[PDB]
Amino acid sequence: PFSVKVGLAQVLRGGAIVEVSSVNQAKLAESAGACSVIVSDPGGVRRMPDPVLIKEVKRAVSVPVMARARVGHFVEAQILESLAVDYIDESEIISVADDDHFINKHNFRSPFICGCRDTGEALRRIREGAAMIRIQGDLTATGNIAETVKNVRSLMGEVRVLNNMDDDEVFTFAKKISAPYDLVAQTKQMGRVPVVQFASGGITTPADAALMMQLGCDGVFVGPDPFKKLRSIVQAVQHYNDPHVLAEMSSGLENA
Amino acid sequence: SPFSVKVGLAQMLRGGVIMDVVNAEQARIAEEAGACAVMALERGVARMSDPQMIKEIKQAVTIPVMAKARIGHFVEAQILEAIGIDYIDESEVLTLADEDHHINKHNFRIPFVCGCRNLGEALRRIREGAAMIRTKGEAGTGNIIEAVRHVRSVNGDIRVLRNMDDDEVFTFAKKLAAPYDLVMQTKQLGRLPVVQFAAGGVATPADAALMMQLGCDGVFVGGDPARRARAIVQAVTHYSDPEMLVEVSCGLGEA
Amino acid sequence: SPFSVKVGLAQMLRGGVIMDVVNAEQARIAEEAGACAVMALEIRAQGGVARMSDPQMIKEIKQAVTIPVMAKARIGHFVEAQILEAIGIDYIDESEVLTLADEDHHINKHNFRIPFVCGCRNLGEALRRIREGAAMIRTKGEAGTGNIIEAVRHVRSVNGDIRVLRNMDDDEVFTFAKKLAAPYDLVMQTKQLGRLPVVQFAAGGVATPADAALMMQLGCDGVFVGIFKSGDPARRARAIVQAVTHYSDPEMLVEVSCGLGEA
Amino acid sequence: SPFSVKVGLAQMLRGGVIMDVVNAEQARIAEEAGACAVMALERGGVARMSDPQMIKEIKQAVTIPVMAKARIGHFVEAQILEAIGIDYIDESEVLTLADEDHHINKHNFRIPFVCGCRNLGEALRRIREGAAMIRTKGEAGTGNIIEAVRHVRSVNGDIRVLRNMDDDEVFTFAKKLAAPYDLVMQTKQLGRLPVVQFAAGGVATPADAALMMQLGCDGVFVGGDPARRARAIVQAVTHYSDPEMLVEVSCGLGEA
Amino acid sequence: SPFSVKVGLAQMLRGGVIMDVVNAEQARIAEEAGACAVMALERGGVARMSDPQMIKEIKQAVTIPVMAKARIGHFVEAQILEAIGIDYIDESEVLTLADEDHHINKHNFRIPFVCGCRNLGEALRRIREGAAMIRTKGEAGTGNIIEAVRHVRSVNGDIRVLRNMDDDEVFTFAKKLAAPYDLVMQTKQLGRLPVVQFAAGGVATPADAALMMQLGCDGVFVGGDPARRARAIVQAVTHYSDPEMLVEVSCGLGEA
């Protein structure tokens, strides 16, 4: 059944996922062509969103709906799975509830997305049962893609090193990145991370979104005039290799 | 055994929620929501609560009444006992009174609750006479992360102890800095020899059920208070029922 | 799988004492005293570089005995291994008592049809060697000292974590695998199985019958011994063998330890 | 209880002197000079349990109790010693430690054990493991009693501190000693060590031996003219508070 | 180009074994056993270029290419070697370094140079200076191949990393190696070292030699019965992937 969840998450390839806080924002995001919306209510402790709000968003749109659970908060996840979400993001953007263990994701029917900063971390989240990885930059609303670029490049580059590696050296490599050897082999044989990989953190402009795509990501998360910027980002991801399109979409974006 | 009797007085709470209260109102609201007991307190230095405010609460409810004594303040305890309280919480949440020693709880008739962060601390409090343990986390933050660490610590060590080679348990007791006898008893039982609650940061129904699913016999709790209280109580009673957890969590209001 | 088969092959060594031998006579004495297998080699007190032993002296030993014959290949030296496989030895010991040949990588032991023994000091190291294809594990203490203290540390280490792992909350095993730096699949397999998924011997400093029996009581499937560095080898070798077979019988242990000579 | 019986077995050694012996000859010389018991041993290098052959020969040559050493943590060596009729087993740190983190589980034996210690906490831990007799060890094979004096004083010192301590402070004290509370309270009640306590390490002269007795020890271990020095020390232990006697047996003793 | 011609000169050594020799006798024994080339040298103390007298005698005793060592940075020693007809010059660190901060400018010579290296950056720097042939050096005169394995693996490892690397990241990679970008890209294109690569240091047995070949080396340097061991190693290099053969030539080789 893990392969089923991994298959499901594929339908998301080529899309932008938008953080919404109201059915109003969820609708816009949908009309703008968002492939999915991630529901949240927003210092302080940041938790799973109110199941009521989540139900309104789910009812108010047709695209798949995602929600956040705190790292290691498997009960929050049980709730989300009970309310019938399409995806659960076990998210470090929210306040971690367990510093030593993540949710055992194979105990759920819902597909999970987890964050990562490097290959090892990605592979560990996946062995735990994540069906989708987001390569996370800044956890804050900084509007800076620097860390995202760092982590996307670290991910891609390790995959490329692994692809070419002398098989006899893969064992030591798995030890070094603290990843399950068998997933490392799978990643090597396939020449790519065995699940959908999205970029997330600081994506503020169409240029940012297109850059992540050109860097090899399968899509992006995004957290004045919001509708216009939303469609521009969707278009940017859809036409990421086309400069003229990108110029058009960036033209007159009030202010990011 | 007078201790075994105290241990028994505490088990009767297994499966419940204990709520901090500062007046007869709150105490009544807490009992209305289904709290298995109430924790009386008035809130600088933090001390035992006024014997008057405690008595007012003792008369305004039918469920057991607990009260805090400062760590090591055995006279505050003596006073609480003389007030006829049901439980005394020698609590690190109040201002520590003796940095080197805890109350000798065996000198009291009333059952004591003590906090802990790991197995050794728990076993040491028990040897001192504690009839109930609350694995503490973070107080006043609404963040559950530390309580989860300590519950996992205690439960994790218990499991390690359960399967350990007997000949190695001595050294293990030394490293825990815990009474060897109480350790072998814990290995034989497969759990703490006393009731074990979680406390610290439990802010939502999900928090409470998590603690129960991690193996806690209950929890302490420190928009709409009445609503949240019932929801938390229900969460603890039905901790492995996602449909319930969803229901009582819906429209909870700012926590 | 061909790995299941190599693992199975090693099962036959359970309750056995493997003995180092530097020539024929010794290999005969080792078999005569009931060793389950011999380990051919031509170190601490001398120095120099210790490598695979000359095939000639390996061929001679394999001809002198009917019990399985082992040989050491330097860590990472996969060509020394290829040569041993070609010579038709029963087991290859990718052995850290020889001079390390590769500091970053062990031999890829799957690439061989002949079963491998690898040393270890703890659980993670054992599970890593196994994933590399090791069909048999020996927890090595310290070599050529006659002191068993380090073997005891390692045996207790591995067995200890295995017991920890056995009763561990399922949701915590991932993190345990990380901390161990060992493949999660093999860790869960070790959890479900309650022990090392392969044969596990003790090695290093086993000097007396009491030492050998001690390892067995700590939960090992057998022991390696370096016997000929003592007064009377035959009697001593016989005593250690008997000790492993009767490890839980103090009366017998007293019997075989009596008048053993200088250890 | 079987433990109280072992403790009782060790009490019949009080006021005595235990002597190391390596052959049947010495054993006789030792018994002849009035030793309460003898300690069988065959002696850098690794030091192990001695050969049962020589242990059997010594147990046959004398009618006084025979002790022998097992390496620390070497429970199989201990099983062998028990099976050959030895009266006491010395889990001794002057042999080569076999296990760095655990001592023998001594309860699992019928033979009474002697264990060494440097302070009270260590003594109590050994006792809880089954030790029926404690020897406060200074240093070995130096002829210098300074370390034994330190330890004897350390143990007796803490016992005195314990005897008069506020009951409510004993918990914390047990923690600081890292010793079992039950045994700590039992030591408080008795006002002494719950088992026989000898001194060992550097006792080289009659005066040394009597000093240990005057400090509180129940007896001593001993590792020119041996037959003469042996009797002198025995006499020293028996008459440790008789200076005139101490002068007489020390007079013209020879090179130590 | 003159450089490409020197590189070509070194390619005719592929699949061969180079042997150190100190007299005409050894040179013959070396050529007799099928060495591709011989290395002329007269051996604490300062180690310098060998006497042209003995170099001339060796170049006369054999028909295979003759190499000789020049101290690192000692360009005049190199001029002398070139003037006496030597086929290859080994700017060798096993001689006493003559210049700590600069190597010989090897382009200024007509003779092809061999230089040592421990990693890729070092190899490329030597090549840019004119080196026509690289030998990955472990340690000298120990008989331990562990260091050679490290370096061979290091060079081949980075080459593989380079081969599959994102083009835009090669600049930074060149910086980190502190190597010339042109040569780095050229190494990326070829997917290997732009020059012949041998292994040197500790090769003491046939198995050692075949291991180097199996790791990727184009050949090896070598520093009981020499005539027998020599042929065995030559055979090892020629048939490095034939275990049966490796067994036959290693059988009864003698003390190494």
Side-chain angles (χ1 to χ4, degrees), chain A residues 1-22 25-26 29-40 42-45 47-57 60-82 84-98 100-108 110-175 177-188 190-196 198-203 205-226 233-237 239-243 245-247 249-252 256, chain B residues 1-13 15-24 26-27 30-31 33-42 44-51 53-54 56-57 60-98 100-108 111-161 163-174 176-187 189-226 229 231-242 244-246 248-249 251 253 255, chain C residues 1-24 26-27 29-31 33-43 45 47-55 57-58 60-61 64-88 90-112 114-120 122-147 149-165 167-191 193-226 228 230-234 237-250 252-259 261 263, chain D residues 1-24 26-27 30-31 33-42 44-52 54-55 57-58 61-99 101-109 111-162 164-175 177-188 190-196 198-227 230 232-243 245-247 249-252 254 256, chain E residues 1-24 26-27 30-31 33-42 44-52 54-55 57-58 61-99 101-109 111-162 164-175 177-188 190-196 198-227 230 232-243 245-247 249-252 254 256:
Chain A
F2 183 54
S3 70
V4 168
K5 300 153 164 168
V6 161
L8 279 176
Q10 312 273 325
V11 306
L12 292 187
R13 290 184 61 152
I17 300 168
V18 188
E19 289 173 70
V20 312
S21 307
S22 64
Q25 288 184 350
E30 188 186 25
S31 54
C35 71
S36 171
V37 303
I38 185 102
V39 176
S40 60
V45 180
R47 311 184 177 88
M48 176 186 75
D50 192 294
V52 156
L53 172 82
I54 288 167
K55 281 182 170 169
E56 288 164 5
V57 165
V61 306
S62 299
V63 296
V65 172
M66 304 196 174
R68 278 168 174 160
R70 289 174 273 169
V71 164
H73 208 318
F74 50 80
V75 171
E76 273 187 344
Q78 290 168 5
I79 292 183
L80 292 177
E81 170 150 316
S82 185
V85 296
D86 298 280
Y87 299 84
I88 296 167
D89 177 358
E90 174 174 33
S91 175
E92 69 290 354
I93 283 67
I94 297 300
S95 310
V96 179
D98 191 329
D100 293 317
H101 311 282
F102 286 77
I103 294 162
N104 178 341
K105 287 164 277 289
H106 295 299
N107 282 353
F108 295 75
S110 305
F112 275 79
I113 184 149
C114 290
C116 79
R117 289 194 299 263
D118 61 53
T119 302
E121 195 178 2
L123 294 193
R124 282 191 301 276
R125 296 296 86 74
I126 286 163
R127 196 55 191 77
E128 291 165 0
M132 176 176 169
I133 289 309
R134 81 182 135 56
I135 313 293
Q136 180 64 206
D138 279 349
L139 277 34
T140 337
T142 59
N144 192 348
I145 53 166
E147 289 312 292
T148 319
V149 168
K150 187 192 306 296
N151 291 333
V152 170
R153 275 198 188 283
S154 167
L155 225 307
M156 301 303 185
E158 300 176 277
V159 169
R160 283 184 289 258
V161 166
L162 179 62
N163 203 26
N164 255 5
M165 186 173 293
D166 165 0
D167 288 333
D168 294 355
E169 286 173 15
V170 189
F171 305 102
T172 291
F173 188 72
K175 179 189 64 191
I177 56 169
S178 301
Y181 167 85
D182 294 84
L183 252 172
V184 168
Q186 179 174 359
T187 294
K188 183 180 190 300
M190 156 156 29
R192 177 217 146 94
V193 144
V195 303
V196 169
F198 268 41
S200 154
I203 305 294
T205 73
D208 287 347
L211 173 79
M212 295 314 307
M213 299 306 283
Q214 299 193 26
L215 286 177
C217 297
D218 297 319
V220 308
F221 286 80
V222 310
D225 183 6
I233 288 166
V234 173
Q235 298 297 284
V237 166
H239 307 101
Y240 63 88
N241 281 331
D242 191 353
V245 188
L246 296 172
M249 278 320 92
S250 312
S251 196
Chain B
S1 168
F3 182 63
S4 54
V5 175
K6 309 216 198 76
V7 167
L9 288 187
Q11 286 175 344
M12 321 281 41
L13 300 178
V17 180
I18 302 165
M19 311 185 187
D20 274 39
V21 297
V22 299
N23 72 50
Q26 291 180 3
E31 190 190 13
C36 80
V38 291
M39 175 69 60
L41 50 64
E42 292 165 12
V45 181
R47 305 175 186 90
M48 178 192 74
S49 282
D50 180 310
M53 85 83 46
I54 289 182
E56 291 176 348
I57 283 175
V61 305
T62 315
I63 50 177
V65 175
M66 292 194 185
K68 294 184 186 295
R70 285 178 273 175
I71 285 176
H73 211 312
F74 50 81
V75 174
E76 277 187 344
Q78 289 166 5
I79 289 176
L80 288 178
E81 183 173 26
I83 291 179
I85 215 157
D86 304 304
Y87 297 94
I88 296 180
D89 182 26
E90 185 180 20
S91 171
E92 64 290 315
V93 174
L94 291 198
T95 306
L96 179 58
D98 180 331
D100 291 2
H101 306 282
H102 276 75
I103 296 168
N104 188 346
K105 290 160 282 284
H106 291 298
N107 292 336
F108 292 77
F112 270 89
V113 179
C114 283
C116 78
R117 289 164 291 116
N118 54 55
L119 186 49
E121 224 183 1
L123 293 187
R124 284 195 298 282
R125 296 298 82 82
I126 291 171
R127 197 56 195 80
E128 294 166 358
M132 180 176 166
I133 282 304
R134 73 175 152 64
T135 83
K136 185 66 186 187
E138 198 162 291
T141 63
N143 188 346
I144 188 85
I145 181 183
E146 287 301 288
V148 166
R149 185 186 323 268
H150 303 146
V151 175
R152 281 211 186 274
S153 168
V154 175
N155 292 335
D157 260 354
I158 296 188
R159 291 189 196 95
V160 171
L161 183 62
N163 207 0
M164 182 174 295
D165 172 3
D166 271 319
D167 300 350
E168 298 185 350
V169 181
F170 302 102
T171 292
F172 184 83
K174 176 181 60 185
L176 289 171
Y180 171 80
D181 300 42
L182 254 180
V183 161
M184 279 302 280
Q185 174 186 5
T186 299
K187 171 188 174 74
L189 289 175
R191 66 155 292 152
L192 263 199
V194 309
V195 164
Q196 177 188 356
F197 273 37
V202 179
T204 71
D207 291 339
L210 174 80
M211 297 306 160
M212 301 301 295
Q213 291 189 36
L214 286 170
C216 293
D217 303 316
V219 309
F220 287 81
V221 179
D224 182 357
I232 284 159
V233 168
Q234 278 313 305
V236 174
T237 296
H238 310 291
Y239 61 83
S240 72
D241 186 359
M244 274 278 202
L245 298 179
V246 170
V248 292
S249 316
Chain C
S1 62
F3 183 61
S4 67
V5 180
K6 311 183 209 181
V7 170
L9 263 175
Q11 299 302 323
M12 75 170 67
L13 298 173
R14 289 171 168 281
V17 172
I18 305 175
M19 303 186 182
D20 282 18
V21 298
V22 301
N23 67 43
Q26 295 191 351
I29 295 174
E31 180 179 21
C36 72
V38 288
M39 167 90 69
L41 25 68
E42 317 167 358
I43 289 177
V49 175
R51 311 176 180 89
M52 181 193 66
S53 286
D54 189 359
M57 83 85 63
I58 285 182
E60 284 158 4
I61 288 180
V65 304
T66 75
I67 49 184
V69 172
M70 304 189 170
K72 291 179 184 293
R74 282 181 281 178
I75 284 186
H77 209 313
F78 52 83
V79 167
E80 278 190 344
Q82 291 160 10
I83 290 173
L84 293 172
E85 189 172 31
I87 281 174
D90 300 321
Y91 299 85
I92 294 173
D93 175 22
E94 196 190 359
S95 166
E96 66 274 12
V97 313
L98 288 193
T99 307
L100 214 51
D102 180 338
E103 139 194 319
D104 295 322
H105 309 280
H106 293 274
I107 295 164
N108 187 334
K109 286 160 283 285
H110 294 291
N111 289 341
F112 295 72
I114 165 172
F116 274 83
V117 179
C118 284
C120 82
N122 57 63
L123 180 57
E125 192 174 349
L127 292 188
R128 284 192 299 274
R129 296 294 84 77
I130 287 165
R131 194 60 191 82
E132 287 165 2
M136 183 183 167
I137 287 306
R138 68 169 160 64
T139 93
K140 186 79 175 180
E142 78 187 20
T145 62
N147 187 352
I149 181 176
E150 283 307 309
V152 172
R153 183 192 319 282
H154 303 151
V155 176
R156 285 197 179 278
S157 170
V158 179
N159 275 334
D161 273 10
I162 296 179
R163 296 185 190 105
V164 167
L165 179 61
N167 181 1
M168 178 175 298
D169 175 355
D170 274 315
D171 303 359
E172 295 179 357
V173 177
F174 303 102
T175 291
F176 192 75
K178 180 184 64 190
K179 157 198 157 179
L180 290 188
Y184 171 81
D185 292 47
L186 258 179
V187 163
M188 279 299 282
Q189 180 186 337
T190 298
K191 178 173 166 68
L193 203 56
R195 59 159 295 169
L196 261 200
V198 305
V199 167
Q200 170 183 13
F201 269 43
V206 179
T208 70
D211 292 342
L214 175 69
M215 302 298 160
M216 298 305 290
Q217 287 185 40
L218 285 174
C220 295
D221 301 315
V223 306
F224 288 80
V225 175
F228 294 108
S230 64
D232 178 6
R238 183 58 199 154
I240 292 155
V241 171
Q242 291 308 332
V244 175
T245 295
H246 299 285
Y247 65 82
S248 75
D249 194 306
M252 188 66 67
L253 295 177
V254 171
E255 181 190 316
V256 301
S257 302
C258 200
Chain D
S1 72
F3 183 61
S4 310
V5 176
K6 294 151 157 182
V7 168
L9 281 168
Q11 285 170 4
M12 68 102 90
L13 293 183
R14 282 181 308 191
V17 169
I18 301 167
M19 307 179 184
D20 286 354
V21 308
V22 307
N23 79 60
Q26 294 186 352
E31 191 192 32
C36 71
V38 289
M39 175 74 79
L41 49 62
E42 318 191 83
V46 174
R48 312 180 182 92
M49 172 193 75
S50 293
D51 177 335
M54 80 102 55
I55 295 183
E57 286 173 21
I58 283 180
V62 306
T63 78
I64 55 183
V66 178
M67 294 180 43
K69 286 173 194 310
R71 289 178 270 178
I72 283 187
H74 209 312
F75 51 79
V76 169
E77 270 183 343
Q79 289 162 359
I80 289 176
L81 291 173
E82 181 175 27
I84 44 181
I86 220 56
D87 295 287
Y88 298 92
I89 295 172
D90 184 5
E91 194 185 12
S92 174
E93 64 295 309
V94 327
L95 282 201
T96 303
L97 222 84
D99 183 325
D101 290 341
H102 311 281
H103 284 73
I104 294 163
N105 188 338
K106 287 160 286 286
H107 289 302
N108 291 345
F109 296 72
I111 307 301
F113 272 80
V114 171
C115 287
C117 77
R118 285 165 287 122
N119 58 66
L120 181 61
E122 193 162 17
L124 296 190
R125 286 192 300 276
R126 297 294 85 74
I127 292 170
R128 197 49 190 89
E129 295 166 356
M133 178 182 172
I134 288 297
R135 74 180 152 64
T136 73
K137 180 58 148 190
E139 63 191 28
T142 65
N144 188 355
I145 53 172
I146 183 176
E147 278 316 295
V149 170
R150 187 186 311 278
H151 306 151
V152 174
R153 282 209 182 271
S154 168
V155 173
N156 290 350
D158 264 36
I159 299 184
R160 290 188 203 101
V161 168
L162 189 52
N164 207 11
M165 182 177 292
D166 187 333
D167 287 302
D168 298 354
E169 293 179 355
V170 185
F171 300 109
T172 295
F173 188 74
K175 181 181 59 183
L177 303 180
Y181 176 80
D182 276 11
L183 258 173
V184 166
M185 281 308 287
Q186 186 187 331
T187 300
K188 184 185 174 81
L190 284 196
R192 66 154 289 161
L193 238 215
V195 307
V196 166
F198 277 41
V203 176
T205 72
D208 288 345
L211 173 63
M212 296 302 148
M213 300 305 298
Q214 287 185 29
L215 286 177
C217 296
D218 294 324
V220 307
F221 288 77
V222 190
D225 184 6
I233 289 164
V234 168
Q235 287 314 313
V237 176
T238 301
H239 313 294
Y240 63 84
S241 73
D242 194 20
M245 179 54 41
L246 289 174
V247 158
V249 287
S250 301
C251 199
Chain E
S1 72
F3 183 61
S4 310
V5 176
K6 294 151 157 182
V7 168
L9 281 168
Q11 285 170 4
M12 68 102 90
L13 293 183
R14 282 181 308 191
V17 169
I18 301 167
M19 307 179 184
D20 286 354
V21 308
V22 307
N23 79 60
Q26 294 186 352
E31 191 192 32
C36 71
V38 289
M39 175 74 79
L41 49 62
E42 318 191 83
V46 174
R48 312 180 182 92
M49 172 193 75
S50 293
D51 177 335
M54 80 102 55
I55 295 183
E57 286 173 21
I58 283 180
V62 306
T63 78
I64 55 183
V66 178
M67 294 180 43
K69 286 173 194 310
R71 289 178 270 178
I72 283 187
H74 209 312
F75 51 79
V76 169
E77 270 183 343
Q79 289 162 359
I80 289 176
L81 291 173
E82 181 175 27
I84 44 181
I86 220 56
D87 295 287
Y88 298 92
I89 295 172
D90 184 5
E91 194 185 12
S92 174
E93 64 295 309
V94 327
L95 282 201
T96 303
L97 222 84
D99 183 325
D101 290 341
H102 311 281
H103 284 73
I104 294 163
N105 188 338
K106 287 160 286 286
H107 289 302
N108 291 345
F109 296 72
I111 307 301
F113 272 80
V114 171
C115 287
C117 77
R118 285 165 287 122
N119 58 66
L120 181 61
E122 193 162 17
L124 296 190
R125 286 192 300 276
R126 297 294 85 74
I127 292 170
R128 197 49 190 89
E129 295 166 356
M133 178 182 172
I134 288 297
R135 74 180 152 64
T136 73
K137 180 58 148 190
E139 63 191 28
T142 65
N144 188 355
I145 53 172
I146 183 176
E147 278 316 295
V149 170
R150 187 186 311 278
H151 306 151
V152 174
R153 282 209 182 271
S154 168
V155 173
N156 290 350
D158 264 36
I159 299 184
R160 290 188 203 101
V161 168
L162 189 52
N164 207 11
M165 182 177 292
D166 187 333
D167 287 302
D168 298 354
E169 293 179 355
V170 185
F171 300 109
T172 295
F173 188 74
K175 181 181 59 183
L177 303 180
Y181 176 80
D182 276 11
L183 258 173
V184 166
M185 281 308 287
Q186 186 187 331
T187 300
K188 184 185 174 81
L190 284 196
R192 66 154 289 161
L193 238 215
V195 307
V196 166
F198 277 41
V203 176
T205 72
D208 288 345
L211 173 63
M212 296 302 148
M213 300 305 298
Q214 287 185 29
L215 286 177
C217 296
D218 294 324
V220 307
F221 288 77
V222 190
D225 184 6
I233 289 164
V234 168
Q235 287 314 313
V237 176
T238 301
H239 313 294
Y240 63 84
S241 73
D242 194 20
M245 179 54 41
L246 289 174
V247 158
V249 287
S250 301
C251 199

